[PDB]
């Protein structure tokens, strides 16, 4: 009750990461999007979603490559295409072919639509996703990157939706919830969604974002090395 | 006369790094070589070198991917192989080969015996130092790792070892102060040192770097992708 859902304003950023901005949105992290530390997403994800830290560390140490600042970012460098930012995204589109940041309901509509005839989302299902959001990337990006290393924080990234939003040990969903999460970067709260019980690690995502990837019927581009890029300045 | 120079005590974390090292053994960075922040070595790298944030920001950046903590390193953690510690260093061993982190005086002696007949070392010498390093690695170890990405680095360090203890607009070093900088950590104060009193920048270091390069008759391994090694629990 501390923490209330605010849209952003003009001047507060936001990132390609629906876990960031709901975060930032509540106030768990600046409502503004600007001056973030890496402590500061290690709290925000404990108080917001049950996140520990370990990954949390890792993808901010790699989140401050984006940023010119000595040891923070806004939310809106994290849009850097190919540091974190890739190809087949759920909710965004490719850098190449449009917008690269912000949550379109034409490319969300293959998870909103995933799993038909179940109330949750699943592992099964988020590996349909990913196999058809990748298929579209190849069909329709001449530039697409697709590595191991993007593939794997696409499992990671829908192991994370699964985990926030529904159980981080089953890797179930309500399907409103993750809705809700994507298309208003807001915690579910009156539609009865709970902070997990359990803290989600890296033992409890790996295992779910492993069997995603044994549904994602993926292989990479065989003439690409995987690569993180480590300025804005490029 | 506030930054002597100490040698490390057992508790006293170092690097194989000379440039951080020194700062250390001068208390610009923390004398135990531990708790150390991206500005903490921007404000270092400043006060004892005159060198400039971008170049610092990136590689402490980076250099935190080599240590478990949220926000900090230690000098030794950036001893992890294939982050940024590398193979054909100009003082320490490989890693498969031996001892990657501490001053080796047989690894240096190709730099202290390079350009003969001079009082300095140069561009022209450092590239010869670069070919020689490298030659001895693909000589004597069967896993080494030559890619763009390390040998960019060890164009930027021998572009560091010069534009520090020497010219910073030149790329000319007197050979007793890289002599001293190496073997003892130590600014060379009583030597008659001095401080740059240019700024050492990117656009100083990376056009010595460029014709280090040049001068060096390198080419990479066709067969490795370049990679940034993300964390010392693999
Ligand atoms: C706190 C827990 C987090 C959760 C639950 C979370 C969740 C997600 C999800 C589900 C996506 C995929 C969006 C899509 O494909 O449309 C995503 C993307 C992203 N996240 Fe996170 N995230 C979290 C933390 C972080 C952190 C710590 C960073 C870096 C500091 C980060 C940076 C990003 C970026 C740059 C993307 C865009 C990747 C892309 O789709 O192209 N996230 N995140
Ligand atoms: C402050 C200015 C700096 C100078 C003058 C400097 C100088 C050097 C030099 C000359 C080497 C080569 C040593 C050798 O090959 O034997 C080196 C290596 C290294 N430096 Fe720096 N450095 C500086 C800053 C940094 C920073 C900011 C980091 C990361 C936080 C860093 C991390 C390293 C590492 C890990 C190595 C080992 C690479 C290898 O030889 O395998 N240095 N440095
Ligand atoms: C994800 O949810 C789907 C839908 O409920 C699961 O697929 C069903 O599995 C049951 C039991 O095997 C079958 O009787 C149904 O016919 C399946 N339905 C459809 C529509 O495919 C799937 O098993 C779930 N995945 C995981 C990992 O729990
Ligand atoms: C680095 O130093 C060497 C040694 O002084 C330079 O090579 C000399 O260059 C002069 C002028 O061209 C010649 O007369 C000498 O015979 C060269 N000496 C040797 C021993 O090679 C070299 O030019 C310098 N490099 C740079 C970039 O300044
Ligand atoms: C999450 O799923 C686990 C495994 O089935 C179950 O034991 C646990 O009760 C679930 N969590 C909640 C809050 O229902
Ligand atoms: C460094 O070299 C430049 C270019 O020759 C010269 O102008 C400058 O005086 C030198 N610096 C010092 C401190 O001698
Ligand atoms: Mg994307
Ligand atoms: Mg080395």
Chains 1, 2 share one sequence.
């Not at 401050?64 to 965004?92: M, N, V, Y």
């Not at 990837?213 to 690569?227: F, L, V």
Request: hydrophobic share 35%.
């Amino acid at each position: 009750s501390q923490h209330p859902w605010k849209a952003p304003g003009p001047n507060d950023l936001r990132s390609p990461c629906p876990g960031l901005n709901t975060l930032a949105n509540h106030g768990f992290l600046p409502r503004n999007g600007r001056n973030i530390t890496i402590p500061m997403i290690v709290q925000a994800g404990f108080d917001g979603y049950n996140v520990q830290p370990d990954i949390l560390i890792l993808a901010a140490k790699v989140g401050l490559l984006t940023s010119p600042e000595p040891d923070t970012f806004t939310l809106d460098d994290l849009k850097l295409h190919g540091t974190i930012e890739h190809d087949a995204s759920l909710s965004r589109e490719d850098f190449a072919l449009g917008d690269n940041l912000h949550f379109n309901e034409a490319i969300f509509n293959t998870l909103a639509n995933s799993n038909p005839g179940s109330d949750v989302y699943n592992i099964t299902s988020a590996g349909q996703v990913l196999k058809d959001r990748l298929a579209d990337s190849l069909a329709r990006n001449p530039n697409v990157t697709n590595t191991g290393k993007e593939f794997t924080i696409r499992t990671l990234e829908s192991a994370f939706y699964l985990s926030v939003m529904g159980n981080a040990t089953t890797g179930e969903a309500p399907k409103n919830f993750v809705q809700i999460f994507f298309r208003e970067e807001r915690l579910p709260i009156e539609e009865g969604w709970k902070r997990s019980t359990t803290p989600i690690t890296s033992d409890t995502l790996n295992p779910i974002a492993g069997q995603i990837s044994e549904a994602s019927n993926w292989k990479p581009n065989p003439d690409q090395c995987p690569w993180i890029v480590l300025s804005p300045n490029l």
